[PDB]
Design an enzyme around this catalytic site. Structure first.
Site, PDB file in Angstrom:
ATOM      1  N   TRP A  12      -5.291  13.953 -57.559  1.00  0.00           N
ATOM      2  CA  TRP A  12      -4.001  13.849 -56.877  1.00  0.00           C
ATOM      3  C   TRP A  12      -3.024  12.909 -57.592  1.00  0.00           C
ATOM      4  O   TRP A  12      -1.858  13.220 -57.711  1.00  0.00           O
ATOM      5  CB  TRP A  12      -4.242  13.443 -55.416  1.00  0.00           C
ATOM      6  CG  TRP A  12      -3.040  13.515 -54.507  1.00  0.00           C
ATOM      7  CD1 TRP A  12      -2.759  12.649 -53.514  1.00  0.00           C
ATOM      8  CD2 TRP A  12      -1.963  14.472 -54.514  1.00  0.00           C
ATOM      9  NE1 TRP A  12      -1.630  13.018 -52.852  1.00  0.00           N
ATOM     10  CE2 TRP A  12      -1.100  14.124 -53.461  1.00  0.00           C
ATOM     11  CE3 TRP A  12      -1.654  15.598 -55.294  1.00  0.00           C
ATOM     12  CZ2 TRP A  12       0.056  14.829 -53.176  1.00  0.00           C
ATOM     13  CZ3 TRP A  12      -0.505  16.313 -54.998  1.00  0.00           C
ATOM     14  CH2 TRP A  12       0.343  15.917 -53.946  1.00  0.00           C
ATOM     15  N   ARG A  32      -7.851   4.331 -65.040  1.00  0.00           N
ATOM     16  CA  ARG A  32      -8.868   3.288 -65.132  1.00  0.00           C
ATOM     17  C   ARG A  32      -9.516   3.244 -66.504  1.00  0.00           C
ATOM     18  O   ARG A  32      -9.723   2.173 -67.072  1.00  0.00           O
ATOM     19  CB  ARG A  32      -9.957   3.553 -64.086  1.00  0.00           C
ATOM     20  CG  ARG A  32     -11.055   2.514 -64.118  1.00  0.00           C
ATOM     21  CD  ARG A  32     -11.898   2.550 -62.878  1.00  0.00           C
ATOM     22  NE  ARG A  32     -12.775   3.707 -62.848  1.00  0.00           N
ATOM     23  CZ  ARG A  32     -14.108   3.676 -62.917  1.00  0.00           C
ATOM     24  NH1 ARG A  32     -14.795   2.542 -63.053  1.00  0.00           N
ATOM     25  NH2 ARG A  32     -14.784   4.814 -62.853  1.00  0.00           N
ATOM     26  N   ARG A  33      -9.858   4.416 -67.028  1.00  0.00           N
ATOM     27  CA  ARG A  33     -10.579   4.519 -68.303  1.00  0.00           C
ATOM     28  C   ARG A  33      -9.702   4.973 -69.471  1.00  0.00           C
ATOM     29  O   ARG A  33      -8.849   5.858 -69.327  1.00  0.00           O
ATOM     30  CB  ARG A  33     -11.761   5.474 -68.146  1.00  0.00           C
ATOM     31  CG  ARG A  33     -12.828   4.926 -67.238  1.00  0.00           C
ATOM     32  CD  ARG A  33     -13.970   5.883 -67.106  1.00  0.00           C
ATOM     33  NE  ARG A  33     -13.603   7.122 -66.419  1.00  0.00           N
ATOM     34  CZ  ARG A  33     -13.788   8.352 -66.905  1.00  0.00           C
ATOM     35  NH1 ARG A  33     -14.385   8.558 -68.083  1.00  0.00           N
ATOM     36  NH2 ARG A  33     -13.420   9.402 -66.182  1.00  0.00           N
ATOM     37  N   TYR A  48      -9.683  16.275 -64.305  1.00  0.00           N
ATOM     38  CA  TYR A  48      -9.374  16.285 -62.880  1.00  0.00           C
ATOM     39  C   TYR A  48      -8.404  17.384 -62.502  1.00  0.00           C
ATOM     40  O   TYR A  48      -8.231  17.661 -61.323  1.00  0.00           O
ATOM     41  CB  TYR A  48      -8.825  14.929 -62.450  1.00  0.00           C
ATOM     42  CG  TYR A  48      -9.876  13.854 -62.417  1.00  0.00           C
ATOM     43  CD1 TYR A  48     -10.788  13.784 -61.381  1.00  0.00           C
ATOM     44  CD2 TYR A  48      -9.969  12.919 -63.433  1.00  0.00           C
ATOM     45  CE1 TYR A  48     -11.755  12.796 -61.352  1.00  0.00           C
ATOM     46  CE2 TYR A  48     -10.923  11.938 -63.417  1.00  0.00           C
ATOM     47  CZ  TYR A  48     -11.827  11.889 -62.376  1.00  0.00           C
ATOM     48  OH  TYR A  48     -12.783  10.904 -62.371  1.00  0.00           O
ATOM     49  N   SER A 128      -2.150  19.092 -48.552  1.00  0.00           N
ATOM     50  CA  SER A 128      -1.738  19.074 -49.936  1.00  0.00           C
ATOM     51  C   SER A 128      -2.944  18.931 -50.846  1.00  0.00           C
ATOM     52  O   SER A 128      -3.118  17.894 -51.534  1.00  0.00           O
ATOM     53  CB  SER A 128      -0.719  17.933 -50.183  1.00  0.00           C
ATOM     54  OG  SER A 128      -1.321  16.640 -50.145  1.00  0.00           O
ATOM     55  N   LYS A 178      -9.081  12.561 -40.614  1.00  0.00           N
ATOM     56  CA  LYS A 178      -9.284  13.997 -40.711  1.00  0.00           C
ATOM     57  C   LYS A 178     -10.362  14.367 -41.713  1.00  0.00           C
ATOM     58  O   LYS A 178     -10.972  15.433 -41.600  1.00  0.00           O
ATOM     59  CB  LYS A 178      -7.977  14.773 -41.035  1.00  0.00           C
ATOM     60  CG  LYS A 178      -7.295  14.432 -42.340  1.00  0.00           C
ATOM     61  CD  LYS A 178      -7.836  15.253 -43.523  1.00  0.00           C
ATOM     62  CE  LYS A 178      -7.299  14.723 -44.830  1.00  0.00           C
ATOM     63  NZ  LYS A 178      -7.743  15.517 -45.996  1.00  0.00           N
ATOM     64  N   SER A 241     -11.702  21.410 -50.262  1.00  0.00           N
ATOM     65  CA  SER A 241     -11.931  20.126 -49.622  1.00  0.00           C
ATOM     66  C   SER A 241     -13.282  19.492 -49.984  1.00  0.00           C
ATOM     67  O   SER A 241     -14.312  20.107 -49.762  1.00  0.00           O
ATOM     68  CB  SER A 241     -11.867  20.266 -48.111  1.00  0.00           C
ATOM     69  OG  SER A 241     -12.249  19.040 -47.506  1.00  0.00           O
TER      70      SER A 241
HETATM   71  N1  NDP Z   1      -6.636  17.189 -53.247  1.00  0.00           N
HETATM   72  C1  NDP Z   1      -6.842  15.912 -53.468  1.00  0.00           C
HETATM   73  O1  NDP Z   1      -7.719  15.522 -54.506  1.00  0.00           O
HETATM   74  C2  NDP Z   1      -6.163  14.966 -52.554  1.00  0.00           C
HETATM   75  C3  NDP Z   1      -6.505  13.623 -52.543  1.00  0.00           C
HETATM   76  N2  NDP Z   1      -5.851  12.734 -51.728  1.00  0.00           N
HETATM   77  C4  NDP Z   1      -6.188  11.269 -51.711  1.00  0.00           C
HETATM   78  O2  NDP Z   1      -5.928  10.576 -52.915  1.00  0.00           O
HETATM   79  C5  NDP Z   1      -6.764   9.424 -53.074  1.00  0.00           C
HETATM   80  C6  NDP Z   1      -7.394   9.361 -54.491  1.00  0.00           C
HETATM   81  O3  NDP Z   1      -8.346  10.396 -54.673  1.00  0.00           O
HETATM   82  P1  NDP Z   1      -8.242  11.652 -55.721  1.00  0.00           P
HETATM   83  O4  NDP Z   1      -6.980  11.532 -56.509  1.00  0.00           O
HETATM   84  O5  NDP Z   1      -8.634  12.940 -55.137  1.00  0.00           O
HETATM   85  O6  NDP Z   1      -9.504  11.133 -56.612  1.00  0.00           O
HETATM   86  P2  NDP Z   1     -10.661  12.090 -57.206  1.00  0.00           P
HETATM   87  O7  NDP Z   1     -11.604  12.365 -56.116  1.00  0.00           O
HETATM   88  O8  NDP Z   1     -10.144  13.301 -57.890  1.00  0.00           O
HETATM   89  O9  NDP Z   1     -11.373  11.077 -58.233  1.00  0.00           O
HETATM   90  C7  NDP Z   1     -11.766   9.774 -57.813  1.00  0.00           C
HETATM   91  C8  NDP Z   1     -10.944   8.697 -58.518  1.00  0.00           C
HETATM   92  O10 NDP Z   1     -11.418   7.381 -58.210  1.00  0.00           O
HETATM   93  C9  NDP Z   1     -11.223   6.609 -59.389  1.00  0.00           C
HETATM   94  N3  NDP Z   1     -11.604   5.153 -59.426  1.00  0.00           N
HETATM   95  C10 NDP Z   1     -10.727   4.063 -59.607  1.00  0.00           C
HETATM   96  N4  NDP Z   1     -11.388   2.876 -59.572  1.00  0.00           N
HETATM   97  C11 NDP Z   1     -12.668   3.257 -59.332  1.00  0.00           C
HETATM   98  C12 NDP Z   1     -13.768   2.482 -59.186  1.00  0.00           C
HETATM   99  N5  NDP Z   1     -13.597   1.187 -59.061  1.00  0.00           N
HETATM  100  N6  NDP Z   1     -14.975   3.140 -58.940  1.00  0.00           N
HETATM  101  C13 NDP Z   1     -15.047   4.535 -58.851  1.00  0.00           C
HETATM  102  N7  NDP Z   1     -13.916   5.311 -58.989  1.00  0.00           N
HETATM  103  C14 NDP Z   1     -12.800   4.648 -59.231  1.00  0.00           C
HETATM  104  C15 NDP Z   1     -11.794   7.569 -60.419  1.00  0.00           C
HETATM  105  O11 NDP Z   1     -11.553   7.132 -61.735  1.00  0.00           O
HETATM  106  P3  NDP Z   1     -12.504   7.499 -62.999  1.00  0.00           P
HETATM  107  O12 NDP Z   1     -12.064   8.818 -63.617  1.00  0.00           O
HETATM  108  O13 NDP Z   1     -12.225   6.321 -63.923  1.00  0.00           O
HETATM  109  O14 NDP Z   1     -13.939   7.600 -62.552  1.00  0.00           O
HETATM  110  C16 NDP Z   1     -10.969   8.790 -60.044  1.00  0.00           C
HETATM  111  O15 NDP Z   1      -9.648   8.680 -60.573  1.00  0.00           O
HETATM  112  C17 NDP Z   1      -7.838   9.512 -52.002  1.00  0.00           C
HETATM  113  O16 NDP Z   1      -7.654   8.594 -50.936  1.00  0.00           O
HETATM  114  C18 NDP Z   1      -7.667  10.956 -51.527  1.00  0.00           C
HETATM  115  O17 NDP Z   1      -8.108  11.154 -50.208  1.00  0.00           O
HETATM  116  C19 NDP Z   1      -4.745  13.132 -51.043  1.00  0.00           C
HETATM  117  C20 NDP Z   1      -4.234  14.416 -51.097  1.00  0.00           C
HETATM  118  C21 NDP Z   1      -4.856  15.446 -51.961  1.00  0.00           C
HETATM  119  O1  G3P Z   2     -10.527  17.359 -50.695  1.00  0.00           O
HETATM  120  P1  G3P Z   2     -10.308  16.508 -49.461  1.00  0.00           P
HETATM  121  O2  G3P Z   2     -11.289  16.834 -48.334  1.00  0.00           O
HETATM  122  O3  G3P Z   2     -10.280  15.057 -49.925  1.00  0.00           O
HETATM  123  O4  G3P Z   2      -8.870  16.813 -48.909  1.00  0.00           O
HETATM  124  C1  G3P Z   2      -7.704  16.745 -49.702  1.00  0.00           C
HETATM  125  C2  G3P Z   2      -6.712  16.642 -48.575  1.00  0.00           C
HETATM  126  O5  G3P Z   2      -6.347  15.307 -48.397  1.00  0.00           O
HETATM  127  C3  G3P Z   2      -5.673  17.727 -48.499  1.00  0.00           C
HETATM  128  O6  G3P Z   2      -4.765  17.354 -47.506  1.00  0.00           O
END
Ligand code: NDP
Ligand code: G3P
Ligand code: NDP
Ligand code: G3H
Lengths: 312, 312
Positions: A12, A32-33, A48, A128, A178, A241
């Site tokens: 995201w 991060r990396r 990703y 989203s 949720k 999800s």
């Molecule tokens: N569809 C989606 O993916 C959606 C996600 N969200 C929200 O966005 C937020 C971020 O998640 P999302 O972008 O999906 O992440 P992902 O699940 O795709 O990946 C996890 C992330 O956590 C990172 N990270 C940073 N610091 C650490 C650490 N200390 N230890 C382990 N991991 C770490 C990973 O980095 P690394 O590559 O270095 O391991 C990676 O970027 C969440 O709260 C999520 O709920 C909201 C809407 C849509």
């Molecule tokens: O893949 P999930 O279950 O983390 O859901 C992503 C959502 O936050 C979409 O709204």
């Protein structure tokens, strides 16, 4: 006038940053990396984001953040605190994308930001899935908080519609909780797809969530909008999800801990449910669904006995 | 107190059998002597897969008595022509059918009031017949006369009945969710746009509620099982005929040939027309229903419709 410092290059963070970059905004993405930074900057790909060119500029240096930046938080909630604490300066504000509640402190992201940075805060949240946003499929989300009008203008696209509201607490709580319900919904899919059961679960689930939020002063209407029912629906019913998939695999017989260690993606509901349970016990709020998801995930409760218990 | 189940389709047969299996006195009426004889002799029906139907079937409306509960399970556009043939008036009606009569713009409660003039209740919720036959967890709501008593007799361990007071809201919610589900199915025919579907469903429940409250429905009804719950199971389940109809139209099939291809009834196809007449007559704006009408009745390309609805 303004620059977006996107903090976290997961699915995201990367997709959102890229979208903003494609909007003609000034954007930098922190990963991060160094290996991720390199893949983005050199080969314009991220593991990703499947089949999508990433052209936004990435950095591994937090020292690049400037006091005039919009900090966009896209780090999973349990890791937000340690990273904010290492920012060399306070940004002009925070736009949060992350959905969850910090386990130890019971804090929402707004509250972490308040404690550490103390700058204006806004939260974007709705149905989203990043995979669909990357493919430019129609998406609508809500945005609550400070400067929401200006943010609406700079974030919105043809396919990504931003509605504003005023209920930060409600939006944060709906987006965080949720994921917990979605775990419970995936369990039903893991049984074979019990559709009547899931819809009944979702109905009772939005209500459980609304009760938790209203106890912390959320508006009931927030739960009937995109941040609540919308996000719940997209999460419980989409193949994309991670939380629903996690529940589905537990139901199939996979070990919950082992599942978590199997991916680099974060399953927020597995962490949020523990935070939610600590709050619920301290404030004596009944959370039947959350309590069963907690038992299944952390206490090894058989998914089917969980199902039956929740019915009575 | 005998249940006289009028109509041996997917849901009349399953509901009748369930009551029979729970020890209630039931008789099932089927329009066709062939279906009657299958059920009584071969203990099967083509409307219920791999499941033995032991409930007694009849083809004779003359068998109804003034002490019976008349359970209606005939699709809405065909109720009237059958109720006009009843030799006597039943003690009351429990209605299972979801829709609005095109000819008149009437709900089932208003058809029963006009023709029979007896007490009335409606049972409605997220309850796909295929799943209820398999004894999978299901929850619905019941509103109207004698609901408390009917709750006690109808409920099983896997079929849970909740009661509420809002007959009008429950009827409109169940009728109109089928119109939203055609729209939801269209998104599945484009390939599955999950974020869009969720946004559609969020807007859809509000469009439904607006129509209902115009007729004195309770807002809370739409956030329960009859409203959001049924909307969710119908927009998201492989068992939904209304979702399938939309999916197939988006894939290029002709709406009429789709309808003629099956003995089952796509209630949303008929309900949308009745909604539009009511909406035009009452100057109620109905964006989603309007586009569904245009796609189904006026050959409007689903992609053009999607584009236009987004501008609203
Ligand atoms: N569809 C989606 O993916 C959606 C996600 N969200 C929200 O966005 C937020 C971020 O998640 P999302 O972008 O999906 O992440 P992902 O699940 O795709 O990946 C996890 C992330 O956590 C990172 N990270 C940073 N610091 C650490 C650490 N200390 N230890 C382990 N991991 C770490 C990973 O980095 P690394 O590559 O270095 O391991 C990676 O970027 C969440 O709260 C999520 O709920 C909201 C809407 C849509
Ligand atoms: O893949 P999930 O279950 O983390 O859901 C992503 C959502 O936050 C979409 O709204
Ligand atoms: N999962 C489900 O199918 C659910 C359905 N509902 C509701 O139940 C109601 C009844 O539908 P359902 O059981 O699904 O029916 P089906 O779609 O399974 O079958 C259509 C039925 O229409 C019948 N029919 C009866 N009289 C006529 C006639 N007068 N002219 C033309 N067709 C006639 C057919 O009879 P014949 O076999 O002789 O052609 C058949 O029994 C609907 O309003 C529906 O919304 C509610 C909950 C669950
Ligand atoms: O609760 C869902 C039922 O109304 C069946 O829906 P459907 O007619 O779209 O198959």
């Amino acid at each position: 006038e303004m620059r977006f410092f996107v903090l976290g290059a997961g699915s995201w963070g990367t997709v959102f940053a890229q979208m903003l970059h494609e909007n003609g905004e000034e954007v930098i993405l922190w990963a991060r990396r160094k290996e991720i930074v390199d893949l983005i900057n050199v080969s314009h790909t991220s593991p990703y984001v499947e089949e999508s060119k990433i052209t936004v500029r990435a950095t591994n240096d937090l020292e690049e953040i400037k006091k005039e930046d919009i900090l966009v938080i896209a780090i999973p909630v349990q890791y937000i605190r340690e990273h904010l604490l290492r920012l060399p300066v306070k940004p002009s504000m925070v736009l949060n994308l992350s959905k969850g509640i910090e386990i130890k402190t019971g804090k929402r992201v707004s509250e972490i930001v308040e404690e550490i940075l103390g700058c204006p805060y806004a939260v974007l949240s709705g149905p989203s899935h990043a995979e669909e946003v990357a493919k430019k499929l129609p998406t609508a989300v809500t945005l609550a908080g400070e400067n929401s009008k200006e943010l609406q203008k700079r974030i919105s696209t043809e396919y990504f519609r931003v509605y504003t509201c005023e209920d930060v607490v409600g939006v944060e709580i709906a987006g965080a909780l949720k994921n917990v319900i979605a775990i419970a919904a995936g369990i039903l899919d893991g049984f074979g797809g019990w559709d009547n059961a899931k819809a009944a679960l979702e109905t009772r689930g939005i209500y459980e969530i609304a009760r938790f939020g209203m106890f912390f002063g959320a508006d009931q209407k927030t739960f009937m909008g995109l941040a609540g029912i919308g996000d719940l629906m997209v999460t419980c019913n989409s193949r994309y999800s991670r939380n629903r998939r996690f529940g589905e695999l537990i139901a199939r017989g996979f070990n919950p801990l082992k599942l978590l260690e199997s991916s680099n993606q974060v399953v927020e509901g597995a962490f949020t449910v523990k935070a939610v349970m600590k709050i619920a016990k301290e404030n004596k709020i009944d959370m039947p669904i959350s309590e069963e998801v907690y038992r299944v995930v952390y206490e090894g409760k058989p998914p089917l006995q969980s199902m039956r218990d929740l019915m009575r």
